[PDB]
Symmetry: C2
Subunit: 310 residues, 2 copies
Amino acid sequence: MSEFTRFEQVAVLGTGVLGSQIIMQAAYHGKKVMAYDAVPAALEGIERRWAWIRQGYEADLGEGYDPQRFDEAIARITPTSDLGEALADADIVIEAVPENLELKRKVWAQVGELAPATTLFATNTSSLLPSDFADASGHPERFLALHYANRIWAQNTAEVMGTAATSPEAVAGALQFAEETGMVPVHVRKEIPGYFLNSLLIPWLQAGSKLYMHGVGNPADIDRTWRVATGNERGPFQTYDIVGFHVAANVSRNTGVDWQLGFAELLEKSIAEGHSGVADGQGFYRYGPDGENLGPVEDWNLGDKDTPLG
Amino acid sequence: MSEFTRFEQVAVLGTGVLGSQIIMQAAYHGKKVMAYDAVPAALEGIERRWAWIRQGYEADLGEGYDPQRFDEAIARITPTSDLGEALADADIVIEAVPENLELKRKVWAQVGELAPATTLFATNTSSLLPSDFADASGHPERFLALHYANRIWAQNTAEVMGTAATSPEAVAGALQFAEETGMVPVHVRKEIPGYFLNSLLIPWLQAGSKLYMHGVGNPADIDRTWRVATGNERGPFQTYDIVGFHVAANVSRNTGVDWQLGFAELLEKSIAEGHSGVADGQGFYRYGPDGENLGPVEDWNLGDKDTPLG
């Protein structure tokens, strides 16, 4: 029989903010990586992203971060705009291209035609159902979702979710890959939109931002209540800061709900001021170079206004 | 003018699970407490609650637990079945009686007639809107809600939520009272059913148990994913263990949703075996005498079954 147990060569499709984190995560664990992107400009300035991840790593991993390891990881990364080359020796493909269905189908048709028959196919999608484009690959039995969070070095969940077609060997292989790349692997046993992480996070974040937008409390009040009453360390607005404002704005905008559109507008105004989250050192909270919380940003607070808008 | 700035005498209405916890919170912080109950058995067996509260204090407060202080706190509590005696010198009344609207209104009518004109009125309701029975006290301007969590010595949040009639001075007094009884006080600036805590908790726990009941993952997988990805220490099922299966099964039955009924029926089976959560040392997880988590309990795990019922 056939069973994906060897993961020495990795192909990652797309070199964006998540793509590059995924690439570095595999490279930093001693795996050769073809960093594929169709846009040459993105390839050319990829050193920018190794430096940013590098500063993320050091500030969060403490002693798990070895600058010699990071350089060897960089040296194991081969950027390329040739799909055939990216796939030629690939044991696993991790597609992380934009969340547009027609773009997924087109890239996956090419991957199924170019990649070896023994290659595990994985998508990182957060906004589409994997079974909605698994057929475009030509091999849905080897096709699953492998889902990450943000700043994956620190928040190293890997959620493996097959479709109805995905073989158990494929599920096991993807969970093995996650284990070999420093991740905490979990098996999402049915195909659902939000996996585990986003199924919990979306209702929680929504409720948090609803209380703020309706003038019921300040971000720090909501987070503190959550921390103290549940014994947790990070509440909704500390979590927004880690998710980052760009992704949070889009989600909030895609709801269609007025009050969530207001929330998105406030996040975008703060993106404009250079304050999009922990990656800028400021969002709802102020952060140092360590990533430590230096306290809440008071300009969010309601004061005596009814709501953040009025 | 009027401003509730002295809290020496406390009346707590109801000596149940939460009521007794509120009674001990105040007395442990140097306040005389009249512990009122119309049920003679609750009063005669009230030392049971002190001993159950004592164990929790010790297991969670660590160095903040002083057995001599606990004794002086017990000696400051006066169990009584005379409402008039309970209220006679009361600076604040905290009503902790069952969540029945008619019973609320009747109790608060008696309180409004018997209490001093300077007494602050607070309810701890979790399932009713305070303005639905505020008028029954006759004095809605000094009537607000003061909302606790479970095991309040460790989960020491206090949410102060006025109605539209609540005066600011009453809000300030409720917040000062919480400050003087060892809580983290927050102001819920608009009357809403879920305060901060329950507003965030209910959709979170709902999504948690919905994943498990539909066979998408095991309790430990869902909690682990939440912990690692969000940087937190307690997932939804660690939280169910703390909230306790009795409350959890009730809120699940209250929705009327079939799968939540099934979840409640599983919680109730586990109650029958002596595993209702942390108070028993076991629920979704096993615990020690100190409250340490010793691992998930395997019986909830899906194994090869499609859902926890099949």
